[PDB]
Design a binder for this molecule. Structure first.
Ligand SMILES: Nc1cc(-c2ccccc2)no1
Ligand SMILES: Nc1cc(-c2ccccc2)no1
Ligand SMILES: [Mn+2]
Ligand SMILES: [Mn+2]
Lengths: 137, 137
């Protein structure tokens, strides 16, 4: 059976600015780099940046809702969002759901999110106020 | 700071076949389903399937290398891969450039992977068989 996410791999158009974004701006740990990629960690997450000449710098209106959310504590959320804002990182959505969320773009337009709250927290809120058509299992 | 992937959200074009793929075929746990999405877990991974009219069924030659790998044990890897093959699940890559992996597509062409091994194990393997120009930190 499957036991979790093993790794997330993001195709990148330019390796250096992507390493700078994930390591220096977002604070992830850089473990290795090679001519066409890098390995970083963020808590348990194994992130791979893969240099790919097929990656387009993609405006958010031109990509679907697929996105990658990173955990942060409530206490740290506002200062991290302010850090991204200072760095000029673009926002692609405003938060309208439960739990703090900041929706931001990576240099290639990958859709990212900072989120505070677990699946258990979300399910508890949904049980009290179910979405349209919502069924629990 | 950031610690871990909070959740992975995949945009899907048809909710029912996608839920069936992740729950029935891949064995993930379905927690809730509503008219426009579903919440599943795979170990400690929170997966959200989000119905998105913008999602296109995308052939693998039309998308970049961005992909999502799920952990599986050495004992279960081959029989799970063979069952996906026998079920007609499409593939997108054959060459094992990052260890023991099986590369397959979801119904919308999201690039998925079964992988055996941790980041620490991949780094150890790379010390002996490094990618071109590899540096370790
Ligand atoms: N139960 C179930 C099987 C599948 C499937 C999807 C694509 C290809 C082959 C099988 N999806 O759900
Ligand atoms: N065939 C079928 C439909 C469903 C369903 C479950 C929860 C919510 C909406 C639909 N489960 O099986
Ligand atoms: Mn999200
Ligand atoms: Mn991979």
């Amino acid at each position: 059976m499957l036991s979790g996410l093993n790794h997330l791999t993001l195709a990148v158009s330019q390796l250096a600015p992507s390493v700078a974004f994930y390591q220096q701006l977002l604070g992830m740990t850089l473990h290795a780099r090679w001519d066409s990629g890098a390995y970083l960690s963020c808590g348990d997450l194994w992130l791979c940046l893969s240099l790919d000449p097929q990656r387009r710098v993609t405006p958010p209106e031109e990509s679907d809702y697929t996105h990658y959310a990173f955990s942060i504590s409530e206490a740290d959320f506002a200062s991290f969002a302010a850090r991204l804002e200072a760095a000029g990182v673009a926002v692609w959505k405003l938060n309208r759901s439960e739990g703090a969320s900041h929706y931001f773009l990576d240099p290639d337009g990958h859709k990212l999110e900072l989120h505070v709250g677990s699946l258990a927290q979300r399910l508890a809120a949904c049980r009290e106020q179910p979405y349209k058509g919502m069924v629990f299992f």
